[PDB]
Design a protein. Structure first.
Length: 118
C-alpha cells in the first residue's frame, strides 16, 4: 500500500489488511488543515524513518479522517490528531497515544510497548 515517508496510508479498503500484517501498528487519524496535525506530520515521519533505519517491525500509519470518516467514527475519533496503537490486530482495545509529539518520544513510547529490539 501507499507510503509517505515510511508512514502507511490507510483507508477503509486496506485498514483490516494492515492490522493483520502488522502486530505493532500506530495509527494517526488527522485532518490536513489542522495545525497540530501539520506540526505533527514531520515528527511522525521522522519517527517512522528511524524505526525503519533500525530494522523494526513496528509500523506507523495515518488516516485522513475527513476523507475516511466512517472509519474514523468507528474508532470514536472526535478531534485531531487522534493517535491509537493496535496490538496483534485487535481493534476492540487500542491503546491511546497521549505522550509527546516529537520524533524521539514517539519511538520511545513504542519501545516501551514492545521492546528495545522489536
Amino acid at each position: 500500500p501507499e507510503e509517505e515517508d515510511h508512514v502507511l496510508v490507510l483507508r477503509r479498503s486496506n485498514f483490516a489488511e494492515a492490522l493483520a500484517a502488522h502486530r505493532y501498528l500506530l495509527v494517526e487519524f488527522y485532518a490536513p488543515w489542522c495545525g497540530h496535525c501539520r506540526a505533527l506530520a514531520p515528527e511522525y515521519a521522522r519517527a517512522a524513518g528511524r524505526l525503519r533505519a533500525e530494522g523494526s517491525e513496528i509500523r506507523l500509519a495515518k488516516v485522513d479522517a475527513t476523507e475516511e470518516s466512517d472509519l474514523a467514527q468507528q474508532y470514536g475519533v472526535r478531534g485531531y490528531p487522534t493517535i491509537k496503537f493496535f496490538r496483534n490486530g485487535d481493534t476492540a482495545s487500542p491503546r491511546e497515544y497521549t505522550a509527546g509529539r516529537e520524533a524521539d518520544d514517539i519511538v520511545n513510547w513504542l519501545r516501551r510497548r514492545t521492546g528495545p529490539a522489536a
